[PDB]
Each structure stands twice: as structure tokens, then as C-alpha cells.
Enzyme design. Structure first.
Site, PDB file in Angstrom:
ATOM      1  N   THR A 197       6.271   0.892   0.908  1.00 53.56           N
ATOM      2  CA  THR A 197       7.345   0.229   1.629  1.00 53.56           C
ATOM      3  C   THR A 197       7.407  -1.222   1.198  1.00 53.56           C
ATOM      4  O   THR A 197       6.381  -1.888   1.079  1.00 53.56           O
ATOM      5  CB  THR A 197       7.134   0.312   3.144  1.00 53.56           C
ATOM      6  OG1 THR A 197       7.057   1.688   3.538  1.00 53.56           O
ATOM      7  CG2 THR A 197       8.279  -0.390   3.885  1.00 53.56           C
TER       8      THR A 197
ATOM      9  N   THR B 187       0.483   4.695   1.817  1.00 48.80           N
ATOM     10  CA  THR B 187      -0.225   5.395   2.874  1.00 48.80           C
ATOM     11  C   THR B 187      -0.293   6.887   2.621  1.00 48.80           C
ATOM     12  O   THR B 187       0.691   7.501   2.195  1.00 48.80           O
ATOM     13  CB  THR B 187       0.472   5.182   4.205  1.00 48.80           C
ATOM     14  OG1 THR B 187       0.480   3.780   4.498  1.00 48.80           O
ATOM     15  CG2 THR B 187      -0.247   5.948   5.318  1.00 48.80           C
TER      16      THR B 187
ATOM     17  N   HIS C 202       0.803  -1.199   0.000  1.00 52.41           N
ATOM     18  CA  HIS C 202       0.000   0.000   0.000  1.00 52.41           C
ATOM     19  C   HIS C 202       0.846   1.263   0.000  1.00 52.41           C
ATOM     20  O   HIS C 202       2.029   1.249   0.371  1.00 52.41           O
ATOM     21  CB  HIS C 202      -0.914  -0.009   1.226  1.00 52.41           C
ATOM     22  CG  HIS C 202      -0.172  -0.072   2.526  1.00 52.41           C
ATOM     23  ND1 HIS C 202       0.290  -1.256   3.064  1.00 52.41           N
ATOM     24  CD2 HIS C 202       0.189   0.901   3.392  1.00 52.41           C
ATOM     25  CE1 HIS C 202       0.907  -1.005   4.205  1.00 52.41           C
ATOM     26  NE2 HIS C 202       0.863   0.296   4.427  1.00 52.41           N
TER      27      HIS C 202
ATOM     28  N   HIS D  22       5.178   6.707  -1.291  1.00 51.38           N
ATOM     29  CA  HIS D  22       5.946   5.488  -1.485  1.00 51.38           C
ATOM     30  C   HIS D  22       5.174   4.237  -1.089  1.00 51.38           C
ATOM     31  O   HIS D  22       4.172   4.304  -0.380  1.00 51.38           O
ATOM     32  CB  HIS D  22       7.219   5.565  -0.633  1.00 51.38           C
ATOM     33  CG  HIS D  22       6.949   5.533   0.839  1.00 51.38           C
ATOM     34  ND1 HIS D  22       6.636   6.662   1.567  1.00 51.38           N
ATOM     35  CD2 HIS D  22       6.909   4.499   1.711  1.00 51.38           C
ATOM     36  CE1 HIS D  22       6.425   6.325   2.827  1.00 51.38           C
ATOM     37  NE2 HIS D  22       6.583   5.017   2.939  1.00 51.38           N
TER      38      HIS D  22
HETATM   39  N1  LIG Z   1       3.598   8.973  12.119  1.00 50.45           N
HETATM   40  C1  LIG Z   1       3.308   7.635  11.662  1.00 50.45           C
HETATM   41  N2  LIG Z   1       3.215   6.627  12.548  1.00 50.45           N
HETATM   42  C2  LIG Z   1       2.933   5.339  12.098  1.00 50.45           C
HETATM   43  N3  LIG Z   1       2.750   5.104  10.756  1.00 50.45           N
HETATM   44  C3  LIG Z   1       2.845   6.097   9.879  1.00 50.45           C
HETATM   45  C4  LIG Z   1       3.128   7.389  10.311  1.00 50.45           C
HETATM   46  N4  LIG Z   1       3.168   8.219   9.217  1.00 50.45           N
HETATM   47  C5  LIG Z   1       2.915   7.473   8.110  1.00 50.45           C
HETATM   48  N5  LIG Z   1       2.720   6.157   8.507  1.00 50.45           N
HETATM   49  C6  LIG Z   1       2.408   5.011   7.666  1.00 50.45           C
HETATM   50  O1  LIG Z   1       1.281   4.336   8.118  1.00 50.45           O
HETATM   51  C7  LIG Z   1       1.443   3.003   7.803  1.00 50.45           C
HETATM   52  C8  LIG Z   1       1.257   2.146   9.025  1.00 50.45           C
HETATM   53  O2  LIG Z   1       1.995   2.679  10.090  1.00 50.45           O
HETATM   54  C9  LIG Z   1       2.797   2.775   7.291  1.00 50.45           C
HETATM   55  O3  LIG Z   1       2.654   2.547   5.904  1.00 50.45           O
HETATM   56  C10 LIG Z   1       3.506   3.985   7.605  1.00 50.45           C
HETATM   57  O4  LIG Z   1       4.420   4.353   6.631  1.00 50.45           O
HETATM   58  P1  LIG Z   1       5.485   3.311   6.089  1.00 50.45           P
HETATM   59  O5  LIG Z   1       6.581   3.930   5.308  1.00 50.45           O
HETATM   60  O6  LIG Z   1       4.896   2.242   5.188  1.00 50.45           O
HETATM   61  S1  LIG Z   1       6.418   2.327   7.522  1.00 50.45           S
END
Ligand SMILES: Nc1ncnc2c1ncn2[C@@H]1O[C@H](CO)[C@@H](O)[C@H]1OP(=O)(O)S
Ligand SMILES: [Cl-]
Length: 211
Positions: free
Chosen positions: A144, A65, A63, A142
Site C-alpha cells: 500500500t 502484508t 511492507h 501488494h
Molecule cells: N482483515 C484485516 N484487518 C486489518 N489489516 C489487514 C487485514 N487484512 C490484511 N491487513 C493488512 O495488515 C496491515 C495492517 O492492517 C495492512 O497492511 C493491511 O493491509 P493494507 O492493504 O496495507 S491496508
């Protein structure tokens, strides 16, 4: 009583696209870890299996986000969730354009290049936004692919921002090599980018994940 929001909003890749991108990501990590230039930097500390190094991977579907809400406990959550564009786009299918894959000592991911329409769904209040770093809005977007064991949420976006700072200023340099899907760039300090010869397009649904 208050309506309790999602854990986060985002574009959730369809089964097909998710599997497609997941494999692309794994092949990239396998290929990269075996590439002479990478091993050379690596031995500047043998052979590291990057798939194992970036061991914490999204368990469900991949996904992109937008807004992390933590059910409402995150700052700006309710504001983001009640946006007209978010309601209208909810459950709607989009195509996300992936222009590059990258790794750093912390994260592996796919760079997303949002359209202007999709950009309307991008949060206006990120804690460390592109604008704070001289980059256009939504550059942090992005998917991940994987994270090192102690790497916390959000690092992947920050890492992309940093990588995009390297290419902006020109630190890209000549490709140090090439993989089947595109040219490979060493940005120094364990930072690597595969610039895809052909942009990968993934179908995703915009909605809310509750855990
Ligand atoms: N401040 C945050 N805290 C946790 N997750 C966040 C935060 N900001 C963006 N995310 C995003 O929410 C998803 C689940 O945590 C993840 O995809 C987080 O980003 P990722 O780069 O994928 S680790
Ligand atoms: Cl941003």
C-alpha cells in the site's frame, strides 16, 4: 498464559528499498494527477494532488502484508504463525517483484508478483481470496502506498483483485498514455494502472510487526 502474536506478518522493506519505492509511488501520483487523460476523467466529476488525496500512508517502512493476526484475535492467526515455513522464513531477506503501480478512488499501491517460494508464506484462508475471484493464489499481494481518508484496512488488496479482473478479461485496452516508468492504463471508474517497463525489485525482511 498464551503467547500473544504479532499484529501482522509480512515482508518489511529495507530502509533503502522502502525509500526507493516510496519515491517511485509519489512521483507516480504526481505525474498521474498531472496527466491529461486523468484530468479529463477527473473533470468528468480542476487539478487534484493525488498525494494529498491518498493522505493516509504507511508511517513506518513500506511492507507487503501476508497474514493479519491482530495479536491472535484474527481468524487463522495461530495456525498461520505456527506454520513451519513461517518459522523458517522468519527474519529472512527476500526480493519482492513490483510489476505495476495502481490507483482507484480508494487506494494507491504497488502490485507484488510473489515467487512460488514466497507464495508458501501467503495465507491460505484470506476472507476474500484470489480463488474466489477466478485469479491465481497470491494475486492480492501488494504494498500500500496510500489510502483515502475513510478507507479501511485491506481495501488496497481488494482493489488490486478488481483491477486484475479488468486486465484478465481484457478491459485493459490500449494504454491511454505513457509515463517515464511505463505505459498508463485507464480501467474506468477512477481505476488507473502504470505497467512498469522495468520491474522494480525491493529487498524486504519477512517478520512480525507488533505495533
Ligand atoms: N482483515 C484485516 N484487518 C486489518 N489489516 C489487514 C487485514 N487484512 C490484511 N491487513 C493488512 O495488515 C496491515 C495492517 O492492517 C495492512 O497492511 C493491511 O493491509 P493494507 O492493504 O496495507 S491496508
Ligand atoms: Cl489472494
Amino acid at each position: 498464559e498464551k503467547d500473544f502474536l504479532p499484529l501482522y506478518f509480512g515482508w518489511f522493506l529495507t530502509k533503502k528499498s522502502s525509500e526507493t519505492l516510496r519515491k517511485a509511488g509519489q512521483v507516480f501520483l504526481e505525474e498521474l494527477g498531472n496527466h491529461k487523460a486523468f484530468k479529463k476523467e477527473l473533470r468528468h466529476f480542476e487539478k487534484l494532488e493525488l498525494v494529498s488525496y491518498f493522505g493516509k500512508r504507511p508511517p513506518g517502512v513500506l511492507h507487503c502484508t501476508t497474514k493479519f493476526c491482530d495479536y491472535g484475535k484474527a481468524a487463522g492467526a495461530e495456525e498461520y504463525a505456527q506454520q513451519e515455513v513461517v518459522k523458517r522464513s522468519y527474519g529472512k531477506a527476500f526480493k519482492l517483484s513490483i510489476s505495476a503501480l495502481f490507483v482507484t478512488p480508494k487506494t494507491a499501491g504497488a502490485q507484488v508478483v510473489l515467487t512460488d517460494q514466497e507464495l508458501q508464506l501467503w495465507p491460505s484462508d484470506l476472507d476474500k481470496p484470489s480463488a474466489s475471484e477466478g485469479l491465481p493464489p497470491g494475486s492480492r499481494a501488494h504494498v500500500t502506498l496510500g489510502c483515502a481518508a475513510d478507507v479501511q484496512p485491506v481495501q488496497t488488496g481488494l482493489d488490486l483483485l478488481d483491477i486484475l479482473q479488468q486486465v484478465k478479461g481484457g478491459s485493459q485496452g490500449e494504454a491511454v498514455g505513457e509515463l517515464p516508468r511505463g505505459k498508463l492504463y485507464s480501467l474506468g471508474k477512477g481505476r488507473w494502472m502504470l505497467s512498469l517497463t522495468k520491474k522494480m525489485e525491493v529487498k524486504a525482511i519477512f517478520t512480525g510487526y507488533y505495533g
